[PDB]
Paper text:
Here we describe extendable linear, curved and angled protein building blocks, as well as inter-block interactions, that conform to specified geometric standards; assemblies designed using these blocks inherit their extendability and regular interaction surfaces, enabling them to be expanded or contracted by varying the number of modules, and reinforced with secondary struts. We construct twistless helix repeat (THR) protein blocks from identical straight α-helices (typically 2–4 helices in each unit); the length of the blocks can be varied simply by varying the number of repeat units. Restricting helical geometry to ideal straight helices with zero helical twist in principle considerably limits what types of structure could be built, but this is more than compensated by the great simplification of downstream material design, as illustrated below. Using X-ray crystallography and electron microscopy, we validate nanomaterial designs ranging from simple polygonal and circular oligomers that can be concentrically nested, up to large polyhedral nanocages and unbounded straight ‘train track’ assemblies with reconfigurable sizes and geometries that can be readily blueprinted.
Expandability over four different sizes was achieved with cage_O43_129 (+0, +4, +8 and +12 helices). The internal structure of the oligomers is clearly resolved in cryo-EM reconstructions for the first three sizes and in ns-EM reconstruction of the largest size; the distance between the centre of mass of the tetramer component to the centre of mass of the trimer component across the different sizes is 7.9, 9.4, 11.3 and 11.7 nm respectively. Views down each of the three symmetry axes (twofold, threefold and fourfold) are clear for each size (except for the threefold view in the largest size) with slight rotational deviations of the fourfold cyclic component compared to the design model, whereas the rotation of the threefold cyclic component holding the THR remains unperturbed as designed.
Numbering used by the authors:
A (entry chain L): 1 to 307
B (entry chain g): 1 to 314
C (entry chain m): 1 to 162
The structure:
Amino acid sequence: DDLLLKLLELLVEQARVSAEFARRQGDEKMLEEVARKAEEVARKAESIARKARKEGNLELALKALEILVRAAHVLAEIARERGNEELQKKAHKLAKEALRQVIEIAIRAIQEGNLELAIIALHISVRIAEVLLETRPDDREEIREQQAIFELLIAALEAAIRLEKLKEEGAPPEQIERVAEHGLERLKEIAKEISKEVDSPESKRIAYKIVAAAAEFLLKILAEGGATPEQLERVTEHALEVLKEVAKELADSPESGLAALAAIASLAKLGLEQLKEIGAPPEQQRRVTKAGIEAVREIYRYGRKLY
Amino acid sequence: CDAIQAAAALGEAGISSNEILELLAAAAELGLDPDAIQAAAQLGEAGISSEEIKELLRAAHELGLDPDAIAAAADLGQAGVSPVEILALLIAASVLGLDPDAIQAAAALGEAGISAEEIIELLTAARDLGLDPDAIQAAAQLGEAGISSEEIKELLRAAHELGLDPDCIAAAADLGQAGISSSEITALLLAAAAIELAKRADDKDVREIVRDALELASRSTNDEVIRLALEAAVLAARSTDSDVLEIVKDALELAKQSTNEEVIKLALKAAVLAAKSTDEEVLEEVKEALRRAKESTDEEEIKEELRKAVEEAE
Amino acid sequence: CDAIQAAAALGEAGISSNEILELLAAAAELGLDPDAIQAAAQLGEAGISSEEIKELLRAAHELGLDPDAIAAAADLGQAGVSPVEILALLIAASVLGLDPDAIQAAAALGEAGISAEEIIELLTAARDLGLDPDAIQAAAQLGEAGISSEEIKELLRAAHEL
């Protein structure tokens, strides 16, 4: 595939040199042609990107998204020279979908643990921000929402890489505990702060799923570290507790309830799979199950304030 | 007499006398019936811990679950689903307002081993699409056919747009077990539905349009052109309007004449949007745009006239 | 649902997506019914090529064969009769004015392994002698008994003369 993706890059560059010609000399038919050609590129890239999503190749998906941003850059300049609304509307719609897609891929990249793909995804997200910032003369709230998600992902990655450094160094379980413990604290405080300013339901759903994926990463790092069942208990309880109170902040609806439930209980199920793998005794299995069920109980009884 | 059989079942499951008494104490406080208690005995035979069953009983009462919703926990337990995952499915099904048939279809998705988040998102999708439980049962059959969860969402979104019956979704699961790709299953759904409609309404113009679409689709190396042409065939086979028939026949004839995939997609997309739409002035302007195209001296004028029509109708 | 289930049967027969779409193009042009399409699927399961089946369907329409004669095409196909000989047998019976029962007895002569020209001379003899279709069924049973076409013709000639 990469050869086709690079043909799109070459096409885009020829269009971009033609956009210099549109500044240096100018023609409506040239602007029309590069606009249409860039849409044809965008459709080619989108077609590859949907196939890459279905196949699960994140590297190709990120490459295709970056090419979609490269196309969006030239599209935005073409629209700026032409004074054109249709292209700017197309650009905002495409960029907003790309933001959602790259968010979902970035969640997946953190979930699979290849943080270099996540870093590349955030690089692309900065380029999406460059497009959005050029695109809107007016809207601040879209930028706030994107940047809040970015600040959350960055904070989660700062914890993730601090833990991964401890894991690479072979650090003692007590340091892994105190780092993870304060990681969950900082996640909670940042989520609480972000919850003051965000208001898009889909963004809130994203943000919660990100906090959940960050807790999941912390738990899986502790499992890769081979920690004691006492550590698995303490951290799982603190993690579910944080993820519950963050649910009590963010949750407002059946849609958010369903997410909170699915995430919390999946995280507890994954925790119980670590207890199964280490062979922890039945009282630990009961303790974790009770903590999980008491979270589900509290999620229902919080939800019953609204339902 | 029969209330003793629950104690016998729990004793055969190896539950101790004080645990049977404690479970009976909970069942008495909660007022739960002998078959709800039999479902608790089946969870005990599935190896679910007595102290977890106390939470399952409590939760069923605090939710106000009906006996069949309680019974579905035993099927999920014998499918190997955890007490907590059972609590997910039930707690969600309650706020979703699901009926026992939809809950039994969730138990079948549990027997298919689908992840609880994917089950709940599939249930949310079926709820938002306003579908009946047979669509959930057909989604479970697509799970038995091994179709990925967002491809189930594609097949549901397609079947909803196309007004198909649930047995077409069952036949899509049969095509999935035959190893056909989800895009090709969509093409087969489209073509077979267009011809099933043509068997109900065998008009010469319907037969010509459906044939010309199937021909153009069989000629095309591009599956966007296939899906456009076969969806246009479904819309024309449901239609009773001479303007839609003329517009679709002109677009298919122009697409059978032309050698450019872009003009082909423009003409078919314009005809599809005109057939989705319901405005006689848009239909008149589209028929005019097809005259302007067929009588054109320049292919760039074909492209820009069809673009202006598409970008007004979309 | 039924048309999608017929497509699933063509998928179980191993017919590719563009070949099903071409067979569906023929179904739309020729106005094929479900039992004619089921016969095309059974010709597919008998291993007749998609390109030949398109000629078989074209021929069945250009002849004006009825659905039971089209079903007999799949019976002759499962008997292993060559694709043009299916068309000859059906054409001959149709142009003689023979009925679906006589055609089914010709499919039984095909299952008995009788040569196509010998079937056609037997059908011509039964037609000229004015016999009922059970005489063709008896000719198939005499073929299963190993009696020669000359001796079947002698037995029918004797039975008619007496």
